[PDB]
Amino acid sequence: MMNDIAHNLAQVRDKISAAATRCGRSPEEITLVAVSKTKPASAIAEAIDAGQRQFSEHYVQEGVDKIRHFQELGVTGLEWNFAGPLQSNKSRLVAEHFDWCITIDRLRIATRLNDQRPAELPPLNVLIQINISDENSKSGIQLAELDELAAAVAELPRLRLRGLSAIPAPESEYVRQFEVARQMAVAFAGLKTRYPHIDTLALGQSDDMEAAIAAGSTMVAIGTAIFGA
Numbered sequence: 001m002m003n004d005i006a007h008n009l010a011q012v013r014d015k016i017s018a019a020a021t022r023c024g025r026s027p028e029e030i031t032l033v034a035v036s037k038t039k040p041a042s043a044i045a046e047a048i049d050a051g052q053r054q055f056s057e058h059y060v061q062e063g064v065d066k067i068r069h070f071q072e073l074g075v076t077g078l079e080w081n082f083a084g085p086l087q088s089n090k091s092r093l094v095a096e097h098f099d100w101c102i103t104i105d106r107l108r109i110a111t112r113l114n115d116q117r118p119a120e121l122p123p124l125n126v127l128i129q130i131n132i133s134d135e136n137s138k139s140g141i142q143l144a145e146l147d148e149l150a151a152a153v154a155e156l157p158r159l160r161l162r163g164l165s166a167i168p169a170p171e172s173e174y175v176r177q178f179e180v181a182r183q184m185a186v187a188f189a190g191l192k193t194r195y196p197h198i199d200t201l202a203l204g205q206s207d208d209m210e211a212a213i214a215a216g217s218t219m220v221a222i223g224t225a226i227f228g229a
Contacts, residue, residue, distance in 0.1 A: 006050035019213040035223030058084035092116040100125040114156035127165040134169040163200035181215030
């Protein structure tokens, strides 16, 4: 027998592996992040018992409480991503506790995170979020704004610019999912030619995973398919 979370993780990892191989990539090129927002520490603990080490949280206090909880238990090897929209007033908590911030879309927030990172911690890994296809969102920048933001973020020494992220508008057609993901892959490839250690393209959830992986995503973030509704 397996518990549901372990079963689900095995299923998702296998789908990712098959997609990678199918498009000529090594499965190791794709990092699975478990989206644990709204799920209790006990659920994360089951995921950890099933080998999962990287988790994404959307709400600052919830995430910090979980991070502290596992620190207190002495659980090692975890990586925590903050992937919610970040309000200025909560930036210090993120800077003090997270390993990655996925949603950088303004210089002011990057600068605060940089300035609030404790001296004893590694630099905070960051991705610049692109609004690639969502006319109904104000989160993420337009691609035309990327050069300006990336140059500024790259000069913040307590951050490490690692690449790009995006959450496309939901799309029913595979061909459109792929076209949008391809646009992100092109932007990502270009960024690599201009900055060091650009190695992360955070793109794709369950319904658009196949398109994202085929296009070049390196980091997929899955919630419901791991933890249930």
